[PDB]
Amino acid sequence: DVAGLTPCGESKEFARRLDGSVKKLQTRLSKYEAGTPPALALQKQIDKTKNRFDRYGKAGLLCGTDGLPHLITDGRWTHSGEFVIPGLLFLYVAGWIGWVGRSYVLFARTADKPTEKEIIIDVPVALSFVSTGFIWPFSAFKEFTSGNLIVPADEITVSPR
Amino acid sequence: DNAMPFLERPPKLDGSLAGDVGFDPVGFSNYFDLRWLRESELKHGRVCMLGVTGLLVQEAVCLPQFSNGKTPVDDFFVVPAAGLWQVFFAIGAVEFFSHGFKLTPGDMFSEGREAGDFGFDPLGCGKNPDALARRRLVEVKNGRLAMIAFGGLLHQQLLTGQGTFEQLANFKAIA
Amino acid sequence: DTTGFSGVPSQFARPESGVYPAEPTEQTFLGMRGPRAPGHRENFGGKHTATMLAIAALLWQPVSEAGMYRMGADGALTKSSFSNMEVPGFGNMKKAPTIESLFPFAKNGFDASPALFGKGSMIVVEDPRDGCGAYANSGACHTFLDEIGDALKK
Amino acid sequence: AMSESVPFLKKPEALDSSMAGYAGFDPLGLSSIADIKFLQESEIKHCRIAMLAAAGSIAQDIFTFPGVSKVVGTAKMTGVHDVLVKQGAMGQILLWTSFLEVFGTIALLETLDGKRAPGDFKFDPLGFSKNAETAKRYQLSEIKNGRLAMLATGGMVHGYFITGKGPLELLTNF
Amino acid sequence: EMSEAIPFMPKPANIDSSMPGYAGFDPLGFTDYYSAKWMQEAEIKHGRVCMLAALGMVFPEFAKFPQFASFSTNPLEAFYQVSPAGWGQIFLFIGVLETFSYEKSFYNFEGGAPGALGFDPLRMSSNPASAKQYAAAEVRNGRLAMIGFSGMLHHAIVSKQGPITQIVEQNFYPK
Amino acid sequence: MDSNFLKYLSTAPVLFTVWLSFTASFIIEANRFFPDMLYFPM
Amino acid sequence: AKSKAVPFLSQPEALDGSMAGDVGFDPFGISSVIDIKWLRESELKHGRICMLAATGCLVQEVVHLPGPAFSQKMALNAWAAAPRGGMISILVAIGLIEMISNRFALTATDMFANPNRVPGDLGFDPLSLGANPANRARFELSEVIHGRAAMMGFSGMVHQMIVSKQAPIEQLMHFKAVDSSLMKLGGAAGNLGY
Amino acid sequence: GDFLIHHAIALALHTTTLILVKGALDARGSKLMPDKKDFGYAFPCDGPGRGGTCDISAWDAFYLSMFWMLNTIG
Ligand code: CLA
């Protein structure tokens, strides 16, 4: 398929990975009686292993010669669930955390003792800030264009050279 | 009188325009220019008078260089495409010259043009003022009548597929 | 201080606009109460919205029943799509976009009607009770009240 | 001030004897909820449509226009509706009443503006309401007959569901 | 002062009624940070490019140039069917046209009106009313063409056809 | 509850430990009910 | 100065009997940490959603739109069967309604910036049913009570559809008691997993 | 495997560059020692005051980047 890779549902080495993984569990299950807790546990593991391999086979992942699923991250839309869509989810959460922490640091600057607010956090005000982060792209961009995100170069302390 | 006596008379409909019976229930002339709306009403009306004459004539007459459709609305589909395009551009040229190249609502009436007026009276039928006033009201009402009538003729000709006069002489209800 | 979730941007060191428009009281039928321009509710108030909704509901009736209706030998009418009409002058495009492209009921199998629901695709109304009563039932019907009676006699 | 129609209840504080068909009957306080001019226009509209509906049920049981019996046979009341939806009859009625209702929407919005009495379409081609007392007598009468026909229409159609007959043959049989 | 487009928000300070397509619409305040006149030149140039581009996505549905008569009516395939010498000539011609805009912006930025590249051969916009109507109409048709081309592009990605063909075949949703 | 004990629970190490224990706990629960999510399923 | 709902506790501050449905019920003192305006916005919003949702479960059991995609008597099955495109259309339309109806004041920090803004009052009165100020107090009270009742009722309906895989009134008319062998509660760590 | 090792090499190149660039650009001065150019390239420290100034010279950034160069070529 892409880059000479094989879809995991028809690669024979993925099938051998699944078979060897289940024989490894079955030889451990061969040392226990049926209704015992180790037998129940190992059967649950065998079912979980089979479920994982079956799901990966039908997901559109591309296995290599090794038979292990490979990730395509060049930007094509048929593989966006492997890097582009997890990446969009990450950047939303990371920008949320950054926007919320910045909002609390600016609130804490206007406090009676600004350094006491950072080792003893005002939890109602900080929870007020953690709730605001869901619309951080719009709030942060409006913050940028209104001249309130970036400070000018002459209010920043720098080294002599 | 008031056309719709239960409704209050629209505020912008003074009697100065001919054909004014105070009929504006939806609420136009409170949003749009009455000068533009009157120009659209006369243009629609004259096009539909010519259209009803064309529909009736083409049911009987056909130029020798052209084929003949089943119906005068099917006459559109047997005249060559280049001919339709030439007619379209000829009408466009007339629209350009008559309005002086000002066609938009914003500029069409910047020269103090009178709605419906293109300075067209070769036979001098509008020489007399009072006769002109009567012919203004006659024009607007015949235009309104031809608008409804053209709608009727075109849709019945599409539905039946049998003209106007042959339809009347061979009337066949919906079954 | 700041109580928390107070909502005033000056208690959270947030930049506010400083402009808080006066809140009016007039309402519109499919709109909201709020600050408008002068003259806005007089031209786009309840009168406008009701009349426009009425005209849209009237013009739905030709649109929902759109098609090429033609007579056969008798008066029987056949319905066809507007696609079958061919425009004669536009080169390689033979069939042309019509009112069926903005309202494609047929592809989704809707059978639209002027009332909005046709014979096909009619609203479905069923009976939950299933033809039995609240109490003292017999057969494949055993209510919550019957189980209250069943538990009390056991 | 107690209600004349429901004596243990108070007067409904939005209804006054200048209205037509007033009996002080608003126990649930609905005249306080909705605008009263809307309620009056809705009542007269419901009244006139139901008067036409009741007369149509009676007349349809008595006689039927030429040709209609072939297209709709044993069917009556709601049963004809579905058959006549297949033909173009019901759709044509919907179209023309909808056309009238667009202007009725404009009329109702003028009524809520306060420039028109509810139910006033000024329609008096023959002359009956020339005199003021006769106009009042007709106004009270038309609300009274419309109310009676509202309940009538209800009864007629529900009797059709129960028996399959309709108003006149339900009188004749059982 | 309040925005006209968005009645509950305050007016964006750096846009004004003087500008032809003004609606008071700047919710994220780009003009509070960037130059309003640079944004107008960019909006007008994007609009002209998208006006041509929307016409170009639709037009080879009707007729093709004889040379490219074999080329596809899906525009995104006809993009790759053209030879690189042809695309090089297109890029050079656009470059020649962009020399006048490279000279307008970056050198005499403050002299003139946004989008005024000295291209008025037919001497329109002489009449002031016509000039106003044409300015606002160019802006609004440019914005409409931007939205229209963006639509038509992604629709050509989903249904592997052109706009008109997609509509006619009723291929309106992902197959 | 006492305001000085609530002020102690607002100190940085307590909130840090509670917040990341809560964070760790819903990652653990999400991987219990939905294990082996190598890709966004689409 | 004791609470009326909970007679052995003190009356919580920020609860002064002005708001409709104010019976002094705040034992955990959420109103002392979270501003009461935000809490009343959230209570009215939750309640309105639930009022529609409870009615949604009951009506969806009885009345359906046409088509096989809408023939799901059990409401928890309607979630999966109803067309995804239209369900995400509902979600996007809800998001647009949330930003516009709140007038871009959505965050906890910015909502109520305008002193004119009232908790739960979004300006929604299309038919001007609240025009009469005599009816205002009991309307506010009965809206609050309908919202609370519907929160409790929808919670019950959803978890009774989970326990019994039946639509709610059909569950009432074809009732079956819990075996207790199935639907065991907890137990993930008692058996040490699996 | 080649993807992962190329990204590790990129990290090593950037980190070695960071110490060497920071050493070159802070060589003339910083906030701890703003007059660092008066003392030269290789000096031990500025003493225990101002919090401590061990490894503050530009030579010491050569010293610290030598470990990262060895790691990178490794
Ligand atoms: C929420 C506060 C906050 C914010 C908005 C930023 C923002 C930034 N940091 Mg800083 N940083 C922070 C906290 C924060 N930092 C803390 C707590 C530390 C100590 C570990 C650092 C240490 C640090 C270094 C060493 C570097 C940055 C860099 C950067 C920049 C790029 C993003 C990045 O590299 O992330 C990197 C983030 C980290 C290394 C640590 C983040 C730790 C957590 C996840 C964030 C703090 C959470 C905080 C407790 C929020 C509580 C909120 C609550 C009170 C409401 C950006 C300017 C880089 C830079 O200058 O690039 C130009 C860089 O090299 N940061």
Ligand code: CLA
């Ligand atoms: C004035 C405009 C107008 C026009 C152009 C039409 C056009 C049409 N109507 Mg509609 N209709 C109108 C007004 C109009 N109607 C009004 C105001 C009503 C009252 C609500 C109706 C009620 C109506 C019904 C119920 C039916 C039609 C039907 C038709 C179709 C008849 C086609 C045919 O072959 O009939 C040829 C028939 C004739 C030439 C005979 C006409 C004579 C009729 C039978 C006399 C009726 C008199 C009546 C009692 C007058 C009282 C008026 C009052 C109650 C409003 C056609 C599409 C029929 C249809 O769609 O069938 C497919 C159908 O069944 N129309």
Ligand code: CLA
């Ligand atoms: C941008 C406008 C737009 C467009 C082009 C579409 C297009 C489509 N939608 Mg819709 N949709 C929209 C906006 C839009 N949607 C919005 C804003 C919502 C949220 C309220 C929805 C919710 C929605 C649902 C839930 C469904 C669709 C469906 C469909 C598809 C089939 C439509 C059909 O067959 O109609 C012909 C059918 C009808 C006209 C029947 C109408 C049924 C009535 C009117 C429902 C009552 C509405 C109710 C009162 C809503 C009130 C809430 C609202 C005010 C917020 C089609 C792709 C369906 C789908 O995906 O099927 C494949 C589907 O199930 N949509």
Ligand SMILES: CCCCCCCCCCCCCCCCCC(=O)OC[C@H](CO[C@@H]1O[C@H](CO)[C@H](O)[C@H](O)[C@H]1O)OC(=O)CCCCCCCCCCCCCCCCC
């Ligand atoms: C302008 C608008 C006008 C609207 C007018 C209509 C609405 C007016 C308000 C109506 C409010 C509801 C009234 C009922 C309407 C339906 C009537 C009906 O037939 O119901 C339908 C059902 C019965 O349904 C019956 O089914 C039978 C077959 O099984 C029959 O054949 C009939 O179908 C039908 O009569 O009614 C009930 O289930 C009532 C249950 C009991 C309700 C309370 C009874 C009286 C109170 C004493 C109870 C004490 C209990 C103590 C504890 C006991 C614990 C076990």
Ligand SMILES: CCCCCCCCCCCCCCCC(=O)OC[C@H](COP(=O)(O)OC[C@@H](O)CO)OC(=O)CCCCCCCCCCCCCCC
């Ligand atoms: C205002 C809204 C009010 C919500 C009320 C909640 C109603 C339902 C609550 C449980 C009902 C009965 C439970 C019996 C069921 C029961 O007790 O099962 C027992 C289970 C532990 O299993 P065992 O050790 O009992 O195994 C026992 C053996 O018999 C079987 O193997 O207890 C739990 O830990 C499960 C709950 C998760 C604990 C963490 C929850 C998530 C934490 C989120 C942050 C805190 C929130 C509150 C946490 C408590």
Ligand code: KC2
């Ligand atoms: C001829 C063009 C035109 C048509 C065909 C048309 C049709 C309908 C229909 C048809 C189904 C409905 C239901 C409807 C309803 C509303 N229109 Mg109307 N409308 C048209 C023109 C304008 C303008 C120019 C404005 C406007 C407005 C509103 C408001 C909000 C008021 C508010 O909430 O305060 C509501 C509810 C104003 C606005 O704010 O729009 C965001 C505004 O300036 N409309 N409109």
Ligand SMILES: CC1=C(C#C/C(C)=C/C=C/C(C)=C/C=C/C=C(C)/C=C/C=C(\C)C#CC2=C(C)C[C@@H](O)CC2(C)C)C(C)(C)C[C@H](O)C1
């Ligand atoms: C400058 C100047 C003059 C000049 C000139 C020139 C060359 C002027 C050229 C003007 C042009 C080409 C304007 C074209 C605008 C196109 C638009 C607005 C299309 C929008 C498409 C839409 C909205 C759509 C869509 C679609 C979507 C997305 C989904 C589809 O499935 C379907 C659908 C089709 C509905 C001259 C030469 C006279 C001289 C003068 O002195 C100065």
Ligand SMILES: CC1=C(C#C/C(C)=C/C=C/C(C)=C/C=C/C=C(C)/C=C/C=C(\C)C#CC2=C(C)C[C@@H](O)CC2(C)C)C(C)(C)C[C@H](O)C1
């Ligand atoms: C915002 C928020 C709130 C909230 C909220 C909530 C939870 C709101 C939920 C709203 C919902 C559920 C809206 C549902 C809309 C359904 C539609 C439009 C159906 C269209 C059917 C169609 C097009 C069809 C079809 C057809 C197809 C295709 C093929 C046929 O075989 C079948 C069929 C014929 C039927 C509130 C107000 C409470 C408060 C606060 O302000 C915050």
Ligand SMILES: CC1=C(C#C/C(C)=C/C=C/C(C)=C/C=C/C=C(C)/C=C/C=C(\C)C#CC2=C(C)C[C@@H](O)CC2(C)C)C(C)(C)C[C@H](O)C1
């Ligand atoms: C405001 C406004 C207007 C409006 C509007 C609207 C849309 C008003 C609609 C309001 C609605 C839909 C209210 C619904 C309340 C539902 C309740 C109280 C259910 C409680 C359930 C319980 C207690 C239960 C239960 C159950 C459980 C758990 C166990 C089950 O086995 C069984 C059982 C069923 C018994 C309009 C738009 C007209 C305009 C106007 O200008 C302004």
Ligand SMILES: CCCCCCCCCCCCO[C@@H]1O[C@H](CO)[C@@H](O[C@H]2O[C@H](CO)[C@@H](O)[C@H](O)[C@H]2O)[C@H](O)[C@H]1O
């Ligand atoms: C006139 C529209 C104006 C703006 C429209 C622009 C839309 C903006 C982007 C929305 C994307 C369109 O949404 C896309 O189309 C339809 C909508 O159900 C869905 O398509 C799905 O449902 C349709 C409708 O029955 C089926 O015929 C089709 O087989 C199925 O794939 C796609 O899964 C979805 O990806």
